Structures are given as structure tokens and as C-alpha cells.
Amino acid sequence: ADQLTEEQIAEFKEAFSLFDKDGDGTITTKELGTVMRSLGQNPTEAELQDMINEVDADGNGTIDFPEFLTMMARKMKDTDSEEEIREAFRVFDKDGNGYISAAELRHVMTNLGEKLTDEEVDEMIREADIDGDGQVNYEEFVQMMTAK
């Protein structure tokens, strides 16, 4: 049996809220670069359309809600997320102090069309803020990413 309430849908929507400006159920191949441009790394025009082909639901570059995360959910353990534990630390760390604040984080995601501000989101850091610096430490990565 499978059940998804407002708790499992918000974490499933949290990923769709970035690649979709209004959340119509389908995202453009151009939004990926909008998230990658936020990740700091973003590929060329055709190199980004190749990311939707990994699942090829419509083979047009557009993808639905249950179709994008499916081929991407099996690719988390189909590689090595340990080498990745340091990457999210290398990406998020703007000043390289060991803690990344949410104040800059959502202003960062805001270039996509967020309904949340870089400031008001900081109420969220409290979920991964184990060091209490109002930012995320190196200790929260292994807890949230390794222990899902």
C-alpha cells in the first residue's frame, strides 16, 4: 500500500517548485538550466535537453509530475552519493565558512520564480541547523542525504 499526504507531496512539490514557475504539471527543458544556473553549473542548450531524454516519456523535452522523478529516483544509488556528500558542501558554501545561510539561498532560487523569499524561508534552516549558526553545517549533509 502507498499513501501520500501533504507531508509527502510538499517534498515532492519542493522539487517541482523550482523547475516550474506556476506548477502546471509540465516543465520546459529551459528551466533545468535555471536550476543548474542556481547550482552554479549549467550545460549548453542541447546538453540540457538530454536530461529529459533519460526518461523520454513524450520524447519532446517536456515531462509530467510522476515521470521526471521516476528515472531520477533510481539514479541516486546507481552511482555514488558519498563523493556527492562533499559536492553539496562545495556548491552551497558561498563564503566557505562551513555554514550556508538561507538568506542568500532563496534569493539564489528566487531567479526561477519562487513564491518564497530568501529571508522568510530561514524558518526552514531549523530542520538541518544542528550547529545553531542560522546556517547548515557539514554534519547535516550526512544526516539528511545519507540517512533519507
Partner: peptide
Amino acid sequence: KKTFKEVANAVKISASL
């Protein structure tokens, strides 16, 4: 993945492609 854990993991999946 719940609120800020999923937003962090989404960054991990967008780079492993």
C-alpha cells in the same frame, strides 16, 4: 527530503545527470 532536505538533495540529483 521533507522541507529543506529535499531542496538540498535536488541539487545532488541535478549534478549527477
